């Protein structure tokens, strides 16, 4: 009725959508950040627009694969800002943000795996602080590129439609994939952009540098601040629902 | 019945959308600018190609985030040829106007406050004739420019559908969006593209140049022609409605 | 009934339509190529993918306005597909045949007035067969580039919804804009890629030099074998309506 | 009733069109890898992004046009997964492989047709493992990328909705050219990116060299194995379906 249990195991398969997901989306954007910085050929390889590229059109990827089944967050920043507007369960919440984290690290061993030379020489698709920033103007950057991409993803929410056995909103996919192309664009030169604590952790524990992990926490707490705004914004100040 | 206000409090919260809205454009927009200008390694930005996406690209998830709230319009331009054609009023056109304005010159600020050397350094993100050009070229430019977008958003106009509370017809994102797209390709090496009143006002106030100001009615009288000439256009020539 | 003419009016705002749209195809397109030609920074344009991406998304933007006006055929070998095909009457074939060629010419022609020196210096947008190439080659190059865009028209053509008043089929414009990007990655570095007489043929008479006038055959020629084996390839093999 | 045959035509005229499409594909794709190789002005190409995009976006305008009337594979990996979770019957399967194999060859053989110098300098399109990679890494990006894509595809399938006259799922192409676009900004550094033992054989074959013919088996294990785990995780871990 429920009697099957249904939903259950629903709730299991989101929780492993979302770990695959992440996973994919760290292997597809890693590789191809790898891939670009190893290159010897000036302007011979795809270039910091096919990197923004990667970033945002796996997220449309994703999206689109996993918003009917797990409501496609990909991003503990997502999930966060859903959560706070009641549009996700704290129990969900939680394993949803786990298992991002652990797909994350498997999507960047996989790409160390494939090519660990070019990996730790190039930066192990890490984010950081870029030389001639500071901490302060990384992680006013971090919210404001993170409230723009949650902004977007309750601007995409189905008010009628959610994801299978659940109260998640399905999402519009495309949108939100060019929220984060754009994102990047302007993001890339400061930190390499973050908005997705999932991404940004997965790369720091492959890496594992004293630098990257110093730096680390603007990519939590940038991203739950700006995913924490935006929240309030749609739901408060544009009413909006 | 309108007994609660409704509308009102729907206009007021579409003035702070167009106001955010416009805020964001401007941020994402002139910190891929200044990221891109900045860049000292050759064929190591985003190149110009990554400066139209962020343009065109930011107009697309903007307008869709906005339609359903305010009509969707981030531009002083798109606002006065729906005015035109009375599809908004005098009152929502003029507050509409203000908003933008106010949005980019803060867009902008923020990119200061982040980069505030390569900022002033680079050319403040702002409009204004290259060398090599006239001023009627530049002027015909951004008339011929900004004729494509609004041509493009009357085109994309619903005729049953409307913002919130309003009768301003929602819009389809994407084609605006792309014409903003297609717009840079063809005018960035000629005035960086205006197309829009608003963002090459917000550039001006925060880079605060002689050189840019005296510049700056093209890019006011440019957009309002190009706009007032798209409105006879579809409304009256095509007829078209 | 028809009593008010209707229609008539219909028909001359669709050749009106198709001659406006293709004035923008063109002033945008040569605009972008000339900007980039021009343009002394190495990698410091938008690059010929840019320059791709000018005319498919044009094309992307021009079909989507048009559609439910003319049918959105911007092209020669597009109406002249349709025509074969009987989805366009003689009349309105011949009408929009000599629309898009003077649309082409303004288009072309503004670009030159804006850009008097780059534009005779840089090869005024012109096709014409590249060097290493011989003309079976060119011709080749534009009968299959051809081919895809007018295989994608006529799988992208509505059944039941047609241009106001009138049997032309109303045409998806986004696969048909992205059938011209890909034939311009692929044939830019043969043609410039045609695809498109009255584009072609609008180049051709403001450039005005017997090195393209002798190879301008090629571009009218190509796209109408291309669009006739389109034709007879949706309509009798695939069967297909 | 059937009484018509009806049927078979359709089934004939899939395998037609399967075959007509991935010549498109091949012609198209790999003519733009020439183009850009052949190339000597430094920045003066598409590009890799742009190659990427030929990849991407000829496969989401070809499923566009295909979906109704073959299902729109372009792929035999894309068949075999379909095939494993009895979405396609296995005559149907087969000969859609030898189909899209033989418009492969006819597709490449054009390219070199069109410019055999070029052609044969500059690589052939084919793919192979590039150096500084093992075979295992080759193996293990095939698999994974082809994932992605099958992946993709299950979730793009209309579960209501068919190719004419079979029960061969509906696509949605353009998520499914987004996973081709995302796939190749990762693989091309790798092995070109396969993802398509039809796009790796005819390449293979035209081009006809040791090197490549040793490399590729890969090109047809990875995208299989890759096909068959995202047919399995969609239909039996995610049910999904």
Same mark, same amino acid.
């Given at each position: &009725? ?14 492993? *959508? ?29 270039? =910091? ?16 694969? !996993? ?11 997502? !999930? ?9 369960? =704290? ?15 498997? @999507?960047? @061993?996989?790409?160390?795996? &494939? ?15 870029? =030389?001639?920033?500071?901490? +302060?103007?990384?992680? +006013?950057?971090?919210?404001? +590129? ?5 902004? !977007? ?32 664009? *302007? ?19 492959? &890496? ?10 603007? &990519? ?22």
């Amino acid at each position: &009725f429920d009697l099957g249990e249904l939903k259950l195991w629903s709730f299991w398969r989101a929780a492993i *959508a979302e770990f695959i997901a992440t996973l994919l989306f760290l292997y597809i954007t890693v590789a191809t950040v790898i891939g670009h910085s190893k290159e010897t050929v000036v302007c011979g390889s795809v270039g =910091l627009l096919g990197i923004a590229w990667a970033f945002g059109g796996m997220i449309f990827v994703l999206v689109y694969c !996993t918003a009917g089944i797990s409501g496609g967050h990909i991003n503990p920043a997502v !999930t966060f800002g859903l959560f706070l507007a009641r549009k996700v369960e =704290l129990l969900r919440a939680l394993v949803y943000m786990i298992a991002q984290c652990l797909g994350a690290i498997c @999507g960047v @061993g996989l790409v160390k795996a &494939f090519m660990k030379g070019p990996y730790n020489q190039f930066g192990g698709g890490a984010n950081s602080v870029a =030389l001639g920033y500071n901490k +302060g103007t990384a992680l +006013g950057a971090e919210i404001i +590129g993170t409230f723009v991409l949650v902004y !977007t993803v309750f601007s995409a929410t189905d008010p009628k439609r959610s994801a299978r056995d659940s109260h998640v909103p399905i999402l519009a996919p495309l949108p939100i994939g060019f929220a984060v192309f754009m994102v990047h664009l *302007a993001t890339i030169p400061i930190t390499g952009t973050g908005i997705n604590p999932a991404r940004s952790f997965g790369a720091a524990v492959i &890496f594992n540098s004293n630098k990257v992990w110093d730096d680390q926490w603007i &990519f939590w707490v940038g991203p739950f601040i700006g995913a924490a705004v935006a929240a309030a914004y749609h739901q408060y100040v544009l009413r909006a629902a």
